[PDB]
């Protein structure tokens, strides 16, 4: 309907597309039919809230279907723990709606501004990955509008399970998720009980994550230093916890356990001695979400290295700090077991997101990082990428051919297409 210039969150690789934006599900069905009618052409991609940094929710010279008007919560059930929602409902909306039922969104990323469609398509992960897996693990069914114009009901097992698992992490390339049922996590409060620790070095950070203590916490992540020289390199502030029960709340908060409330060298000493603490009761915002639009001069880079390749992980961190590219915003987490989605990002291992200001030599440097990540058995995350190559990506994802095989069965005429799909030869 409306021609619009589109970028991801990273404000990079702009491309103009025809954007459809309607709450009418049948207009969406018809729009897809029109693309298949004179198709494939440049095809169509779904788009949620545009929070992926890269080019997966854009389609230069083709159609983009903005899914955010499709935002109905159909039902929430405390007995079965199931929510039935349109793919355009966002996680903030869902979190608020589900709390009074004693239910918790089972996987929450670092912003609540993502759609359910976006969460499935990038198979997102959170602080609780090591205990809960990623978003795809909790989908009980979804309705997918496929290239033929049919809406397929998909489930994680049984008939069409292959297509379900291709859609999880599928970056919108199997079709348009219209609706889904998610199994929620039961909770008696909206609060976490948290332990904080501060480490002096990378070795001590790795030791903390390898000593077995991760088994005591359902939620775990850390900020880490990627700028100091060794041994300060890789020191971290670690925050770990679990959902609080009602009696763990200060008496004052007990009447309303499920309410979500409204949002130098001296700096280091404070951050360090007070960064260590035990059994601190924290609301969702303080434990997780300190909370606009993201700046334009930064490259987001996220990769995971297999748990066993720990020496190799230490080497990549060393390479980063000696590069003359400086990142202050650095997340670190140890992932748990992967799921069965062929293109799912998380594997067990050392997960890092760094944020580099765009300077001369950055592009070629991150290409060298790609090489290292690949060599050591790791991979990068599509939701954060706009610049890796088809060659590197296919090698990072050993089940890519399996996934492409599914994609071609469900979309032979390439009705579904994006800038990422062409760049990474997934089309
Ligand atoms: C500040 C910030 C913090 C973040 N933290 C995390 C984190 O902790 N963990 C993590 O895993 N990710 C994180 N992300 C990335 C984010 O979770 C993903 O990029 C997510 O997919 C974005 O959701 P969206 O609705 O904005 O989707 P978009 O960016 O609009 O789309 C992303 C992909 O989803 C597809 N898609 C969207 N809706 C549909 C649909 N209805 N049917 C089919 N396909 C669809 C699109 O085609 C596209 O391929 C973060 C991003 C930001 C900006
Ligand atoms: C200064 C802007 O404010 C913010 C807003 C959000 C954040 C946290 N963001 C993230 N947390 C993340 C947390 C994890 C996790 F799960 F904890 F390991 C993984 C990826 C993450 N990616 C981002 C991101 O920015 O892409 C940091 C700062
Ligand atoms: C997808 C990936 C191959 O690069 O496989 C993940 C391996 C390391 O982990 C196994 C799961 C069950 O924990």
Curated annotation (Swiss-Prot):
What protein family does this chain belong to?
Answer: Belongs to the DprE1 family.
Q: Which domain of life is it from?
A: Bacteria
Q: What is the lineage of its organism?
A: Bacteria, Bacillati, Actinomycetota, Actinomycetes, Mycobacteriales
Cleavable signal peptide: none
Provide a GO CC annotation, any one: plasma membrane
Query: What does the record's miscellaneous section state?
Result: Was identified as a high-confidence drug target.
The keyword Transport appears for this protein: no
The primary location reported for this protein is: periplasm
UniProt name for this protein: Decaprenylphosphoryl-beta-D-ribose oxidase
Phenotype caused by lack of the gene: Traditional knockout mutant with dprE1 disruption could not be achieved, suggesting this gene is essential. Conditional knock-down mutant of dprE1 show that down-regulation of DprE1 results in rapid in vitro growth arrest, swelling of the bacteria, cell wall damage, stop of cell division or lysis, decreased survival in macrophages and virulence attenuation. Cells lacking this gene display impaired growth.
Subunit organization: Monomer. Although forming apparent dimer in crystals, DprE1 does not dimerize appreciably in solution. Interacts with DprE2 to form an epimerase complex.
Keywords assigned: Antibiotic resistance, Cell wall biogenesis/degradation, FAD, Flavoprotein, Oxidoreductase, Periplasm
């Amino acid at each position: 309907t409306t021609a619009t210039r589109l970028t991801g969150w990273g404000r990079t690789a702009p491309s103009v597309a025809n954007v459809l934006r309607t709450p009418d599900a049948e207009m969406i069905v018809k729009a897809v039919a029109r693309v298949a009618e004179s198709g494939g052409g440049r095809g169509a991609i779904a788009r949620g809230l545009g929070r992926s940094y890269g080019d997966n929710a854009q389609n230069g010279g083709g159609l983009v279907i903005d899914m955010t008007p499709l935002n109905t919560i159909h039902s929430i059930d405390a007995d079965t723990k199931l929510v039935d929602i349109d793919a355009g409902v966002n996680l903030d909306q869902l979190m608020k709606a589900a709390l009074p039922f004693g239910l918790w969104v089972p996987v929450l990323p670092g912003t609540r501004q993502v759609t359910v469609g976006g969460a499935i398509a990038c198979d997102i992960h959170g602080k609780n990955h090591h205990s809960a897996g990623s978003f795809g693990n909790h989908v009980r069914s979804m309705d997918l509008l496929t290239a033929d114009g049919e809406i397929r009901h998909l489930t994680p097992t049984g008939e069409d399970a292959e297509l379900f698992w291709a859609t999880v992490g599928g970056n919108g390339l199997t079709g348009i998720i219209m609706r889904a049922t998610i199994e929620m996590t039961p909770t008696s409060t909206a609060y976490f009980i948290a332990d904080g620790d501060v480490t002096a070095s990378l070795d001590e950070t790795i030791a903390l994550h390898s000593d077995g203590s991760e088994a005591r916490y359902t939620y775990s992540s850390a900020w880490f230093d990627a700028i100091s020289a060794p041994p300060k390199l890789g020191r971290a502030a670690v925050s770990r916890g679990r959902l609080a029960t009602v009696e763990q709340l200060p008496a004052k908060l007990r009447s309303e356990p499920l309410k979500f409330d409204a949002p130098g060298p001296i700096g280091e000493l404070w951050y360090r001695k007070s960064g260590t603490y035990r059994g601190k009761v924290q609301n969702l915002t303080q434990f997780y979400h300190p909370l606009a639009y993201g700046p334009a001069g930064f490259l987001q880079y996220q990769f995971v290295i297999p748990t066993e390749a720990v020496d190799e992980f230490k080497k990549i961190i060393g390479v980063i700090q000696a590069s003359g590219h400086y990142s202050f915003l650095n997340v670190f987490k140890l992932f748990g077991p992967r799921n069965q989605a062929p293109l799912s990002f998380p594997i067990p291992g050392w997960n890092i997101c760094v944020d580099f200001p765009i300077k001369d030599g950055l592009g070629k440097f991150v290409s060298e990082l790609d090489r290292r990540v690949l060599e050591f058995g790791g991979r990068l995350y599509t939701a954060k990428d706009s610049r890796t190559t088809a060659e590197t990506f296919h090698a990072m994802y050993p089940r890519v051919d399996e996934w492409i095989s599914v994609r071609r069965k469900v979309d032979p005429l390439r009705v579904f297409a994006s800038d990422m799909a062409r760049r990474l030869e997934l089309l």
